[PDB]
Design a protein around this nucleic acid. Structure first.
Ligand SMILES: C[C@H](CCC(=O)NCCC[N+](C)(C)C[C@H](O)CS(=O)(=O)O)[C@H]1CC[C@H]2[C@@H]3[C@H](O)C[C@@H]4C[C@H](O)CC[C@]4(C)[C@H]3C[C@H](O)[C@]12C
Ligand SMILES: [Mg+2]
Ligand SMILES: [Mg+2]
Ligand SMILES: [Mg+2]
Lengths: 93, 1114, 315, 176, 52
DNA sequence: CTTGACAAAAGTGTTAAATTGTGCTATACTGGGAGCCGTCACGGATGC
DNA sequence: GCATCCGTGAGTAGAGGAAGCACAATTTAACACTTTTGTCAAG
């Protein structure tokens, strides 16, 4: 079971909207190289390696954890899509 | 290790030769060694005399005799060079000129006839093959009731298959008796008039029934002459053709009276005479002579029909599934049938050649073209449903293959259109067809086995032996009888108690026409020979069969065919008594011909000097690869200077131990759950099995490659392959072939080959790259043979065939072919399948170190742990009794023979367990040890479970548990006992052909299909997995829209999408959006070829181009 | 199931006493058993409930490790502020659920403590936990149940021997009664009282009734004398088997059908433990083949229905 | 661990004049018991040269210093007149069970690796009896029964096992 | 089961065309004819009479 | 980066030899040949 | 009310598997020769 899956299912009206929000957020993290995250340094997911602890490379794992903090906003007709990417690219070149 | 035998029934005859159904039938057809003048009119001799003489209608070609020559190549040479083991056929013909009277004789070469090996198989194009016997409805005359309307019957006349049409005789509601031929129904009187039957003749014999004869008394055609009736009948049969007497008599005579076209058969003629009570001169419906037709069978058939409808006591309907109405076609008859087909084609080319071209100057050799005859025989032995790839996983596998009976094939039933009734166990199957051995699935009841004591008679009916009983005493006279003959007697069971030869029981269990009855000893007429005559060879190898459910006994007998030979194979502790004869009749071992002395013993050959003085040398087959990939070799069992008797064993064959069938190992088994690794048929084993090489088998694989002539140039097998390092070419010799003894792994080169590159100028980027490094492109490319993924081993043999070599027939354009044999030694591993003879099977899921296994108080650990939850719902209790008897033999050091339905019983097993306890526990007391503290704890619970008697001493209570097959067992991980006594014993377990090594496969990308551009299928092709319709439904029910779209486009046939996805992943990116699949583009084009305009539109109904503008005419 | 089922003894089984000291004193003399039901003053108790009184689950399970009592012995244990009368193995089952969900009070409401845990009771526990706790906590309870179930079945000593197929004593008496009634049906048939059809139907009715009585005699013998028999435990818990398959092992096989559909007049009166005769084995093979042909020839009919349903409702 | 036979390329072959094949001969070599008399010795090679007719036993190996064969009567092969056997057998020292695929040891080109079963212990059992001392009555009496192959005595094996258990008990000393 | 049966009762048969181009005995979907009828009532035309 | 070279690789008629396409044969000859029932059983739609 | 015609029957895996001849048209290959295109040496 994914951690906090019960709370994630309670945040949306339809279970398929949760999958849409998670998948689009993970694409945002991959495209900007995880520099747009809302997580604090002590909250970043980690994986254990022979050389030491490093950042978790799985973007889907990051998206689920961010959505549990309450710092993301999701909905329909929030912003124009072209204007969303332009500002996010300017903030995170 | 001594052998103890149970049972009371004394068999008066031994088993017949187990391959005589194949061997004896093919000898009768050929008649190869019978002198020509003493040959009987059977087999291919009967076919020669049927087609000949050939008359032009003044030239006659006649047949005198034939002979068979020596084979050109031996059996082992044919296997190596991919030839057919055959013999030339010569015919001695003479041509007679009727006008003049001059005769010429010469011998003409007719072709080659395949030869059967001593064990009963053929070598066709270098591969072993088996001809399977066919069962079908017997020809004759049959009477069945009318299903639509009661009180009415239908009479049928059935010839041999493809030897005439079926004839139906029915009484219509109007009262007219009608005859139906070739889907056409016409009154019977029209044909019955052609046979010269008048009004006075018909009413004399059939007028003793009533209103039925009135329907045969029409005066419209009674006065009509037989010649006029003949022409009128011809118009009804084939309307449209001009009515001529010359054409009319040709059709009628050729439909029911021509022996070359209509054949009732020897079995059919015998059936017709027995039923109708008549005597037939030939095998046709009517006899034509003196320019007229004469009746042979039509009148007696009609009398039976009328009398059956009237209700005379002596006439009854026929059961079509009765085994007296079904017959077997063996290999000799099936081969001879195709020989007659091809011979009729040869006579057709003789006729067209003797009326056109040099009629006055002819020779028999110039008339005869044997090409049609050879094509008929070649087609039968290659592409017939009954000619099958031989099963030789072990010697028992090939023996069973030769005794199978199939209802399918040419002239047989179809798998899809076969109903329930034809698949059932008929009551006449008793003693003739095994009731339990059959495949489950779409072939159930359509493929069966011959009973162990059965034999097929000359007409094709199965007979089973019975003992004559006279006046209450049983004699040793044995009579073989068919099902129809068996129905007339009261037959007692084989277990009937006897005092010598006198029947001792007052009440006897017997059968009367298949049903059980209780009778007095004076009413008995016959007796069964043994219980073994009811079952087949495979089922007869299962001990305690009477304690097993038939659904699980079917699995046990089938899976003995799939057992692989082991390097340390041994015979089971508990046997039935057929293990010796199976090895002997399979011809896999070597026996002495007569008394003599062994002179030379080697791993390759044995030389025996016989008492007449002559020396005989026997070469040994060593490390040979079978059709299934298992190694077959023979190991000598004698020493130099040893005296041998006639029939003594000289060398063991595969899966045999001192002449006994050995399909597995004898292991120590505990029946208990273990930590969930036994869950749902899974099996736990010990690492000690691997340490002593139990369940270790040898397998051999073959690889091949060719060097051809091409337009660009010839392919060359060479060691000098471009762009290859020395590490890759290390194990190749100077000729480019891997050396013998090398160890190969996936990706290693086996044979090196180069091919001339096709003419194609390179891409601009490559041209600049070659300019930078100053390298000149070569004219050849690497096309060498490499080890496929997941394979490998040791190279043990190479074979090189070249064009021009004697006996080598290579295809045009092929220069040479190289073959490499690779062998590996397989130990048991997780994922391998194991089974016993009672139908218990499962895969190995866990291998434990020896200190983890449960062990006996003396320190002995068990080998295998089986879950007790698989027993109760399968109801196969035979494995429990085998375990109890194997526990007694472990301590007493003896083996047992318990025949089926007459063998070991619990009081005898418990008397043996009492002796085994005296050595299992009396040994401990002498050594100075008492009862363990841990055994006292288990005994305290055992009497709360009601297993032991309260008040007894611990030694007496331990013996009470031993007589039930239970011991106190310790846990290896903790050292504490299991809380209850556990059943422990010895069991015989086989390792099956299905191994996880041959079945694991994976793929990322690979070959694609031509038209649909989708991935190929199959592990051998490196193909992908089929994601079918029901799998698509599951993804839809989940709501996984994006996962479903990837499988439809990005991973099957979106050519642009699958290229972009691969490039994105190797760059560390997410895969892009998919596009239109290619198979949809194919569907649009194929619909346009059907003149249908299919167009894709957008929201505004405007056209959308999905072909990128590549198919639009500007 | 094996740890949550209690023991029953018969040695005392009815003796009456006056004070608990009298009942305990008789136990050491060997007159009564630990789990035999007795009566102290007016109530029904056992020696184990009077002798072993534990202050908490840890003390009761420590006594099990020392071999003082078994997990199937009924004792007195104090748990959650109540004086319970159960076995240590039922207390152990309660702790498995409490630690898996990490809530002692909620887990106490989820379980039935006074019954052995069978397939249906365990299914009810899963559904209630899903309602109260969600998927994440329910998936943790499933793994704990899986872990302890495998551990306890290994060390308990479950095995199958030939003597575990116990033959009841009433089978011989029933088969003798049926012989007399069958011989009477034949007597009246010769007198013309009944025809061929009604004689046929009466023989079938006699054997249908006899088979049912043997089925109840098999299971009555188990629940009274061998309550821990491997076959009885497997069927009662729902692990494997049904009473129809048990009767064939321990009682009789019964009537068989002909290929035409009719039934043979003589049944198969032997079980798989005793062993069938050759004729009985052949008679039974008609129905085994018929069952196999039904499976092969009718799976296509079911799968064709599924494709019809999908294509009418997929939108 | 590894065997080399002259004029033999792999283990799936036969030798002229020899009754047994290479697979059977190797199965016989897995039953040989060799005792090293020097604790510092790690590997030795045993040489055999024979001509038929004779039954070659384990005593036909040439003598080597500080090496002893414990079962000299072990049968190896049967030689017919005209047969020859010239082989070198390598014996290593180790622990546990090591398949031939894991070590793959070959001293020369045509050598054949052999699965190694290094353990000298054949069977172990222990008994617990009921003893007493004065008033105390529930005391234990322990007996250990050890079966070995002869290269290591049961008393030597018992001492080595006690040291292994004692060594492991020191791992609970320093909590990190 | 109720989802499947709802698809089994999805069609109707015309008994009286009324003021429409439909034909007597024509089979069409129940959803379509109900939409067609309520449109005719708005324009004051005779409705279609159908049968389940 | 620009000249003079310099042979070479590629391009261009010319022609003899393989290779391919086509017409013709005069005693008289005038309607095919293979099939051949455990023929599969049941429901729906059409035409009488 | 009935005779005639037509489309339907679960999934995955394997592993074997009989005419010449004459002569005109057309295509191809061989062989020179002319022209174009790099290298080399200056410079
Ligand atoms: C209650 C106890 C912790 C108490 C504390 O104070 N901290 C926890 C901590 C670790 C837990 C065990 C392990 O998970 C392995 C295993 C997992 C299975 O699922 C259930 C059984 C096992 C044995 C568990 C039981 C129990 O749940 C334990 C002992
Ligand atoms: Mg199959
Ligand atoms: Mg107390
Ligand atoms: Mg050793």
């Amino acid at each position: 079971a994914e951690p906090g899956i019960d709370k994630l299912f309670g945040m949306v009206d339809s279970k398929y909207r949760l999958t849409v929000v998670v998948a689009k957020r993970a694409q945002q993290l991959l495209r900007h190289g995880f520099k747009n995250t809302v997580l604090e340094p002590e909250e970043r997911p980690k994986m254990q390696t022979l050389e030491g602890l490093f950042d978790d490379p799985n973007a889907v794992t990051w998206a689920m954890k961010e959505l549990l903090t309450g710092r993301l906003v999701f909905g329909e007709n929030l912003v124009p899509e072209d204007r969303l990417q332009k500002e996010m690219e300017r903030l995170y070149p | 290790m001594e052998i103890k035998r149970f049972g009371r029934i004394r068999e008066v005859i031994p088993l017949p030769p187990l391959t005589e159904i194949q061997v004896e039938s093919y000898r009768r057809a050929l008649q190869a060694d019978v002198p020509p003048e003493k040959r009987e009119n059977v087999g291919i001799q009967a076919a020669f005399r049927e087609t000949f003489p050939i008359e032009e209608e003044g030239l006659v070609l006649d047949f005198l005799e034939y002979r068979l020559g020596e084979p050109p190549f031996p059996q082992d040479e044919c296997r190596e060079k991919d030839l057919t083991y055959q013999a030339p056929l010569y015919a001695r013909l003479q041509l007679i000129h009727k006008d003049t009277g001059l005769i010429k004789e010469d011998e003409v070469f007719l072709g080659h006839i395949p030869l059967m090996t001593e064990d009963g198989s053929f070598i066709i194009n270098g591969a072993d093959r088996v001809i399977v016997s066919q069962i079908h409805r017997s020809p004759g005359v049959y009477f069945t009731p009318d299903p639509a309307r009661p009180g009415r019957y239908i009479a049928s006349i059935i010839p041999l298959p493809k030897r005439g049409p079926w004839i139906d005789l029915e009484v219509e509601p109007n009262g007219v008796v009608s005859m139906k031929v070739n889907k056409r129904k016409f009154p019977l009187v029209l044909l019955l008039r052609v046979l010269g039957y008048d009004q006075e003749t018909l009413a004399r014999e059939l007028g003793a029934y009533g209103e039925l004869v009135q329907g045969l008394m029409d005066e419209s055609v009674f006065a009509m002459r037989p010649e006029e009736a003949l022409i009128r009948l011809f118009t009804l049969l084939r309307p449209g053709d001009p009515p001529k007497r010359d054409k009319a008599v040709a059709y009628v005579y050729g439909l029911i009276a021509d022996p070359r076209r209509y054949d009732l058969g020897e079995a059919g003629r015998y059936k017709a005479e027995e039923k109708l009570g008549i005597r037939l001169s030939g095998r046709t419906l009517a006899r034509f002579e003196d320019g007229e037709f004469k009746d042979e069978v039509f009148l007696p058939t009609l009398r039976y029909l009328f009398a059956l409808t009237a209700g005379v006591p002596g006439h009854e309907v026929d059961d079509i599934d009765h085994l007296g109405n079904r017959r077997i076609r063996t290999v000799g008859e099936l081969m001879t049938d195709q020989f007659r087909v091809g011979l009729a084609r040869l006579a057709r080319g003789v006729r067209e050649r003797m009326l056109m071209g040099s009629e006055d100057s002819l020779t028999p050799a110039k008339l005869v073209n044997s090409r049609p005859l050879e094509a008929a025989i070649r087609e039968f032995f290659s592409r017939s449903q009954l000619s099958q790839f031989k099963d030789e996983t072990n010697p028992l596998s090939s023996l069973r293959h030769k005794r199978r009976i199939s209802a399918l094939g040419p002239g047989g039933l179809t798998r899809e259109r076969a109903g329930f009734d034809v698949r059932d166990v008929h009551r006449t199957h008793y003693g003739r067809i095994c009731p339990v051995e059959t495949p489950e699935g779409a072939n159930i009841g359509l493929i069966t086995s011959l009973a162990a004591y059965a034999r097929v008679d000359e007409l094709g009916f199965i007979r089973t032996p019975y003992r004559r009983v006279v006046g209450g005493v049983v004699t040793d006279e044995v009579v073989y009888m068919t099902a129809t003959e068996e129905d007339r007697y009261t037959i007692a069971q084989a277990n009937t108690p006897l005092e010598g030869n006198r029947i001792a029981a007052e009440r006897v269990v017997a059968r009367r026409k298949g049903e059980p009855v209780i009778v007095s000893p004076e009413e008995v007429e016959f007796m069964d020979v043994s219980p073994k005559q009811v079952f087949s060879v495979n089922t007869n190898l299962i001990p305690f069969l009477e304690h097993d459910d038939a659904n699980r006994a079917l699995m046990g007998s089938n899976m003995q065919t799939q057992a692989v030979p082991l390097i340390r194979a041994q015979a089971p502790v508990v046997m039935t008594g057929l293990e010796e004869r199976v090895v002997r009749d399979s011809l896999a071992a070597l026996y002495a011909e007569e008394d003599g002395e062994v002179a030379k013993v080697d791993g390759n050959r044995i030389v025996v000097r016989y008492e007449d003085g002559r020396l005989v040398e026997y070469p040994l087959r060593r490390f040979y690869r079978s059709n299934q990939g298992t190694a077959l070799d023979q190991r000598p069992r004698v020493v130099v200077g040893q005296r041998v008797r006639k029939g003594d064993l000289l060398a063991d064959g595969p899966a045999s131990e001192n002449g006994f069938l050995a399909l597995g190992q004898n292991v120590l088994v505990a029946i208990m759950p273990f930590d969930g690794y036994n869950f749902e048929d899974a099996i736990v084993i010990s690492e000690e099995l691997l340490k002593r090489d139990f369940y270790t088998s040898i397998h051999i694989e073959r690889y091949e490659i060719e060097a051809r002539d091409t337009k660009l140039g010839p392919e060359r097998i060479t060691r000098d392959i471009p762009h290859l390092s020395e590490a890759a070419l290390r194990d190749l010799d100077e000729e480019g072939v891997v050396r013998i003894g090398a160890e190969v792994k996936p990706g290693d080169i086996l044979v090196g080959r180069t091919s001339f590159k096709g003419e194609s100028e390179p891409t601009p980027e490559e041209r600049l790259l070659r300019s930078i490094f100053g390298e000149k492109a070569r004219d050849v490319k690497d096309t060498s043979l490499r080890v496929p993924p997941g394979e490998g081993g040791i190279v043990v043999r190479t074979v090189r065939l070249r064009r021009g070599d004697p006996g080598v027939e290579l295809k045009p354009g092929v220069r040479e072919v190289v073959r490499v044999y690779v062998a590996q030694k397989r130990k048991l591993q997780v994922g391998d399948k194991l089974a016993n003879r009672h139908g218990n099977k499962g895969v190995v899921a866990k291998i434990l170190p020896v200190e983890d296994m449960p062990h006996l108080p003396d320190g002995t650990p068990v080998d295998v742990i089986l879950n007790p939850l698989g027993v109760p719902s399968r109801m196969n209790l035979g494995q429990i009794l085998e375990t109890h008897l194997g526990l007694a033999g472990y301590f007493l050091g003896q083996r047992y023979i318990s025949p089926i339905f007459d063998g070991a019983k619990e009081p005898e097993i418990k008397e043996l367990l009492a002796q085994a306890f005296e050595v299992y526990f009396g040994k401990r007391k002498g050594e100075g040890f008492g009862v363990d503290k841990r055994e006292v704890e288990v005994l305290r619970r055992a009497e709360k479970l009601g297993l032991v008697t309260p008040g007894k001493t611990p030694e007496e209570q331990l013996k009470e548990l031993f007589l039930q097959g239970k011991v106190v067992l310790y846990d290896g991980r903790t050292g504490e006992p299991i809380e209850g006594p556990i059943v422990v014993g010895q069991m015989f377990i086989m390792k099956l052909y299905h191994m996880v090594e041959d079945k694991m496969h994976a793929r990322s990308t690979g070959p694609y299909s031509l038209i649909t551009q989708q991935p190929l299928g199959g592990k051998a092709q490196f193909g992908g997995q089929r994601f079918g319709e029901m799998e698509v439904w599951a993804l839809e029910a989940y709501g996984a829209a994006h996962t479903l779209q990837e499988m439809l486009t990005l991973k099957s046939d979106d050519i642009e999408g699958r290229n972009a996805a691969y490039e994105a992943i190797i760059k560390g990116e997410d895969v892009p959006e998919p596009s239109v699949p290619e198979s949809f583009r194919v569907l649009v084009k194929e619909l346009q070829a059907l003149a249908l305009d299919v167009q894709t539109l957008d929201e505004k109904d405007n056209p959308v181009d999905i072909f990128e503008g590549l198919a639009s005419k500007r | 199931y094996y740890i949550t089922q209690v023991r029953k003894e018969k040695k005392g089984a009815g003796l009456e006493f006056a004070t608990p000291e009298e009942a305990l004193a008789a136990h050491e003399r060997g007159e009564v058993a630990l789990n035999a039901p007795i009566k102290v003053a007016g109530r029904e108790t056992s020696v184990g409930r009077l002798k072993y009184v534990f202050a908490n689950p840890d003390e009761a399970l420590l006594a099990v490790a020392h071999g003082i009592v078994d997990l199937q012995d009924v004792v007195t244990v104090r748990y959650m502020g109540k004086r319970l009368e159960t076995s240590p193995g039922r207390i152990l089952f309660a702790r498995i659920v409490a630690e898996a969900v990490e809530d002692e009070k909620v887990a106490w409401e989820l379980i039935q403590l006074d019954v052995p845990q069978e397939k249906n009771s365990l299914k009810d526990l899963v559904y209630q936990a899903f309602l109260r706790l969600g998927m994440e906590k329910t998936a943790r309870l499933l793994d704990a149940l899986k872990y302890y179930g495998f551990t306890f079945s290994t060390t308990s000593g479950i095995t199958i021997g030939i003597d575990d197929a116990v033959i009841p004593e009433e089978k011989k008496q029933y088969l003798e009664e049926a012989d007399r009634k069958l011989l009477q049906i034949e007597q009246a048939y010769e007198m013309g009282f009944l025809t061929d059809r009604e004689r046929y139907d009466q023989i079938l009715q006699l054997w249908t009734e006899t088979t049912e009585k043997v089925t109840q005699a098999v299971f009555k013998n188990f629940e009274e004398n061998y309550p821990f028999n491997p076959l009885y435990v497997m069927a009662q818990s729902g692990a494997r088997g049904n009473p129809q398959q048990i009767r064939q092992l321990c009682g009789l096989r019964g009537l068989m059908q002909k290929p035409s559909g009719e039934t043979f007049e003589v049944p198969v009166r032997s079980s798989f433990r005793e062993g069938l005769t050759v004729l009985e084995y052949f008679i039974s093979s008609h129905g085994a083949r018929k069952g196999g042909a039904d499976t092969a020839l009718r799976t296509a009919d079911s799968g064709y229905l599924t494709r019809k349903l999908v294509d009418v409702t997929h939108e | 661990t590894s065997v080399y036979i002259e004029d033999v390329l792999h283990e799936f072959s036969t030798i002229p004049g020899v009754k047994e094949d290479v697979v059977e001969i190797i199965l016989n070599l897995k039953e040989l018991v060799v005792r090293f008399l020097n604790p510092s010795l790690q590997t030795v090679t045993l040489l055999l040269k024979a001509e038929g007719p004779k039954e070659v036993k384990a005593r036909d190996f040439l003598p080597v210093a500080d090496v002893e064969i414990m079962n000299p009567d072990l049968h190896i092969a049967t030689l017919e007149e005209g047969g020859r056997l010239n082989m070198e057998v390598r014996v290593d020292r180790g622990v546990g069970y090591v398949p031939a695929e894991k070590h793959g040891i070959k001293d020369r080109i045509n050598a054949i690796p052999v699965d190694a079963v290094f353990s000298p212990v054949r069977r172990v059992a222990f008994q617990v009896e009921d003893t007493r001392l004065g008033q105390r009555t529930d005391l234990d009496k322990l007996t250990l029964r050890i079966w070995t192959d002869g290269s290591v005595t049961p008393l030597e094996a018992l001492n080595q096992a006690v040291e292994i258990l004692r060594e492991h008990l020191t791992y609970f000393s320093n909590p990190q | 089961i109720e989802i499947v049966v709802r698809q089994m009762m999805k069609y109707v048969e015309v008994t009286d065309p009324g003021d429409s181009r439909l034909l007597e005995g024509q089979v069409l979907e129940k959803w379509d004819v109900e939409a067609l009828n309520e449109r005719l009532i708005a324009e004051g035309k005779t409705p279609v009479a159908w049968k389940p």
